[model samples]
Target: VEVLLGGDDGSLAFLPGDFSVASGEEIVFCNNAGFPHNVVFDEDEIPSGVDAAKISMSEEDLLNAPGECYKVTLTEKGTYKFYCSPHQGAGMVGKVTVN
Candidate 1:
């Protein structure tokens, strides 16, 4: 799966904003079209039997500039949604399903 947020400093968006993934997966983040971006999730949106706090993730990249994994594994098997911290709301949100 891929996560994207086009940034010519232009649009607050996450292209291909939704997809499916697995416990062991990698997201290239679209050649870093969205720099200065980090994928963050809503605590309230997370489902039960899942610990968002327990999920180990890649270091947030700075594609403003520039910028995967498995075996480490995730605890849940459901919808994993997120958004770019700096430029969300204009629909810079994304979703992933781990099954």
Candidate 2:
């Protein structure tokens, strides 16, 4: 599965907003439109038993160019919530369910 980081209309959001995938599957995120976006899993919002370090990015990380992307593998069955650091307040958030 793939989730885009932003849009061409200058909207700060994840393109699909929310989606689901099977456990052990991979979800890729890319700079589809707006520049310098990144994914940061909410430390306190993730499922227990899943390591936040495996899916979260630091504040210093970002994707600013076209084709720039990030990939995360979901091996834990649960819902994961994340947001773009630069646009979190603008509602640039997304979620993925693994089942």
Candidate 3:
């Protein structure tokens, strides 16, 4: 499955907002709304066994074009909270539940 970053109306958000996925499944986050979009997993919200920093992109690796994206494979069964740093205050956040 996929979660999209950005909106057509100049809104900052994640399409689908929140969803669930199966363990070991790969989810893609694509750039669709605007430039400089990024996905960052919240360190304190993810499973203790998972390392947020290792799985997320930094500001330097933002997805700037339509169709640009990134993949994440969730192996641990739990919840993950993430957001685009630059747009977090705008409510550009999402959650993933792995079962």
Candidate 4:
């Protein structure tokens, strides 16, 4: 997905506002900026959710910097929302709708 960085004071942010994908398809979040970013899934994908135990990613799936990409194979159909670990409340959030 394509995102924008920086706030009014020059922080960082995401652009599209939301993300969508098809079930069984691959969802890739690419960081095209100079900073590090993470797409942290919410509680539904956390260790406490029903299907949480089935949601996981290897080190290679986490983006560390610009040009880095994270790929997740969506196995189930549902709407998943995520946010930048360090910028979640700053309007740097995104949603993933899987069908």
Candidate 5:
């Protein structure tokens, strides 16, 4: 599934910050429309075996240009937490459930 990083509709959030998916599914963090953003997982929140390193994008990454994005596939069933590295203080957190 696809998650928006910015509000092309007038907002500063990841639309639908929380959602569910089947095992092996992937979430694409789109940065086509929001404050500069990068997708990062909260290491402490994901399953023990989950690698937060799955997020290839970082604060130094360019998420403002169109089509720029970060992606991670969830095969482990648990609550995976994430946020925009630069906008977490702006309440830009998100969750993905794979169960």
Candidate 6:
């Protein structure tokens, strides 16, 4: 499933707000604005793919700065929670159910 993160106010959040997927399926979190954004997986079980803190997608991945996207392959079935490092406290959180 492809989830979008960000709002009209430029504040970050997740699209669909909630969703589910199967194991080995890819969850692509995309930043729909020109500003810098990162989807950080805080759970210990899920690999960040960059580092433990946060993974920032380059402008190339973003496609001319208008939209930025990243992908993660769910190797295990479980409930995963993620948040934008820049706006996590503002409720830029998401839940993914992997089956």
Number of the top lDDT candidate: 3
TM-score to true structure, per model: 0.64, 0.94, 0.92, 0.66, 0.87, 0.71
Candidate 5: which stretches are off by over 4 Å?
none
Superposed Cα deviation of residue 24, candidate 3 (Å):
0.7
Better candidate number, 2 or 6, judged by TM-score: 2
Q: Candidate 6, which segments miss by more than 4 Å at Cα?
A: 9-11, 44-64
For each candidate in the order shown, give its overall lDDT on alpha carbons: 0.59, 0.85, 0.86, 0.57, 0.79, 0.64
Residue clash pairs of candidate 1: 35-63, 35-64, 36-63, 36-64, 63-66
- Candidate 4 has which clashing residue pairs, if any? 4-15, 6-11, 6-12, 7-11
lDDT of 2 by residue, 12-51 (tens): 8887888998998888888888779888898787888988
Worst 10 residues of 2 by lDDT: 51-60
Worst 10 residues of 4 by lDDT: 45-54
Give the RMSD in angstroms, all C-alphas superposed, for model 2: 1.0
Off by over 4 Å in 2: none
- Give the distance in Å from residue 71's predicted Cα in candidate 4 to where it truly belongs: 0.7
Q: Give model 4's TM-score versus the native structure.
A: 0.66
Residue 21 in model 4: lDDT: 64
- Model 3 spans with C-alpha error above 4 angstroms: none
- Once model 1 is optimally superposed onto the true structure by TM-score, how far is the C-alpha of residue 61 displaced, in angstroms? 8.4
* lDDT comparison, 4 vs 6, better candidate: 6
Ranking of models by lDDT: 3, 2, 5, 6, 1, 4
- Order the candidates by TM-score, highest first — what do you get? 2, 3, 5, 6, 4, 1
Among the numbered candidates, top TM-score falls to 2
Error of 6 at 78 (Å): 1.2
Spell out the clash pairs found in candidate 2: none
The Cα error of candidate 3 at residue 46, in Å, is 0.4
Question: Which residue pairs does candidate 5 place in steric collision?
Answer: none
TM-score of 1: 0.64
